[PDB]
Amino acid sequence: MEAGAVNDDTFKNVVLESSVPVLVDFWAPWCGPCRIIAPVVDEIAGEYKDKLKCVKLNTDESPNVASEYGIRSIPTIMVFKGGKKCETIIGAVPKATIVQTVEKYLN
Hints:
Blueprint: E1 4-6, H1 8-16, E2 22-27, H2 32-47, E3 53-58, H3 63-69, E4 76-82, E5 84-90, H4 95-105
Parallel strand pairs: 1-3, 2-3
Antiparallel strand pairs: 2-4, 4-5
PDB class: oxidoreductase
Keywords: thioredoxin M, thioredoxin CH2, chloroplastic thioredoxin, oxidoreductase
Assembly: monomeric
């Protein structure tokens, strides 16, 4: 469903403690590719209603988890299936590829 926003605090709830899948985009305002991909991230997440809890994590404001996971370059779109991580996409992508990539993990 539509992509939410997270930070260190909320991430715990919205991601680690999630029931349904999650798609967290580690972004930042300086991250040009992240910004132009974000609409794509959202609309795809809209298509994947109910299950795909899409979200956006500000990497500058929430470096914490980025450091824990080992992330720096962004966009870094991590996938979770139920609390725990499953996959991760890095860099800009064409929507068709994103869609397919999501589908093979979800449906």
